[PDB]
Paper text:
While AMPylases from various pathogenic microorganisms have recently been characterized, the only virulence protein with de-[name] activity known to date is the [name] effector [name] which catalyzes AMP removal from the host GTPase [name]. Here, we present the crystal structure of the de-adenylylation domain of [name] and reveal the catalytic mechanism of [name] de-adenylylation. Instead, the catalitic domain of [name] is remarkably similar to that of the metal-dependent protein phosphatases (PPMs), however with distinctive structural features to distinguish AMPylated [name] from similarly modified substrates. The finding that [name] is a PPM phosphatase with de-[name] activity constitutes a clear example of how [name] has adapted a common enzymatic fold and mechanism to effectively hydrolyze an unusual substrate.
Numbering used by the authors: 37 to 84, 88 to 268, 277 to 350
The structure:
């Protein structure tokens, strides 16, 4: 392993939360929070499974930043999922960044990467069934860019230095399907790619990527809905109307989620009825580095 991992979270045990803290190596540019928003009450309004989510954030040996957001389907497979990401996905990231620099069409480079990941999964990790988005930075033409993709229900948003929030990877929903890295979706990888998210964008130091496995659904908006041959596909974005330009997006998302979750739990308790809703909740932050930090990380990777 030549990449530098500054934050990692392999699930969290039921009933617990995880807050990573900052890592001094990348000057507090990366953090993870992991918990569960699952609520299950009896009729008293009294409370009644571990997380399958994983986030990895770090830098290649070339100092390029990456974030990987993963959501495993099934609790009995979670170690197969977490091992697959370590053993097969992470070693691809450095060459992905180099191929984005070296080839003219980022869309072809990313489609090739997605095909490779399904092939490795088939050959080496049949029990790793999971949705995933990822992104990496790369340098071209004396500027910095970020490219990646998501298949399934994880998302990646970006808060730009000037304060604008944009979606890079949307949460995709397809009627009657759960598109994913799994045996079933591998039958038509190119159709799966076409209806999910691939992106390529210029970034500046201080732009802030926020990856997440889940948010309470009233906090998303529908960016686009379209039909495929007949199923409806929905692209769901974090709704920027809940945010402002001052604090980091990671800070504001945790605050807006926690306020919404206290409202949901209060409503659920007061109904005098069984209630069950919510899911595992894992959030990663990655601030795009400046050149000085990129150079420091390259040195650290060598020594
Ligand atoms: Cl590695
Ligand atoms: Cl660590
Ligand atoms: Cl913990
Ligand atoms: Cl399960
Ligand atoms: Cl392969
Ligand atoms: Cl093989
Ligand atoms: Cl095998
Ligand atoms: Cl496996
Ligand atoms: Cl480009
Ligand atoms: Cl397969
Ligand atoms: Cl296909
Ligand atoms: Cl909505
Ligand atoms: Cl810079
Ligand atoms: Mg899920
Ligand atoms: Mg899951």
């Amino acid at each position: 392993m030549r990449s530098i991992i500054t934050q990692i979270c392999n699930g969290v045990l039921h009933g617990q939360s995880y807050q990573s803290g900052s890592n001094d190596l990348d000057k507090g540019n990366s953090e993870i929070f992991a918990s569960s928003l699952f609520v299950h009450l009896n009729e008293q309004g009294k409370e009644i499974k571990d997380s399958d989510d994983k986030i990895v954030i770090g830098y290649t040996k070339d100092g390029m930043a990456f974030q990987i957001v993963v959501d495993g389907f099934y609790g009995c497979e979670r170690q197969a999922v977490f091992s697959f990401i370590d053993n097969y996905v992470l070693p691809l990231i450095d060459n992905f960044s180099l191929d984005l620099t070296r080839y003219p069409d980022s869309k072809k480079v990313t489609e090739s990467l997605i095909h490779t990941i399904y092939s490795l999964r088939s050959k080496h990790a049949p029990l790793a069934e999971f949705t995933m988005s990822l992104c990496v930075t790369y340098q071209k033409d004396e500027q910095l860019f970020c490219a990646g993709f998501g298949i399934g229900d994880t998302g990646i948003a970006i808060k730009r230095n000037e304060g604008t929030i944009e979606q890079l990877v949307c949460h995709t929903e397809v009627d009657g399907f759960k598109d994913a890295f799994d045996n079933y979706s591998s039958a038509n990888i190119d159709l799966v790619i076409e209806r999910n998210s691939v992106f390529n964008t210029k970034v500046m130091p201080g732009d802030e990527l926020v990856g997440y496995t889940y948010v309470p659904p009233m906090l998303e908006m529908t960016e686009k809905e379209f039909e495929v041959e007949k199923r409806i596909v929905r692209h769901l974005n974090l709704d920027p109307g809940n945010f402002d330009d001052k604090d980091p997006l990671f800070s504001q998302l945790l605050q807006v989620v926690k306020s919404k979750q206290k409202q949901l739990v209060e409503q659920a308790k007061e109904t005098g009825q069984i209630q069950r809703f919510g899911d595992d909740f894992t959030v990663g932050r990655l601030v795009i580095p400046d050149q000085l930090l990129i150079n420091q990380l390259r040195i650290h990777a060598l020594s």
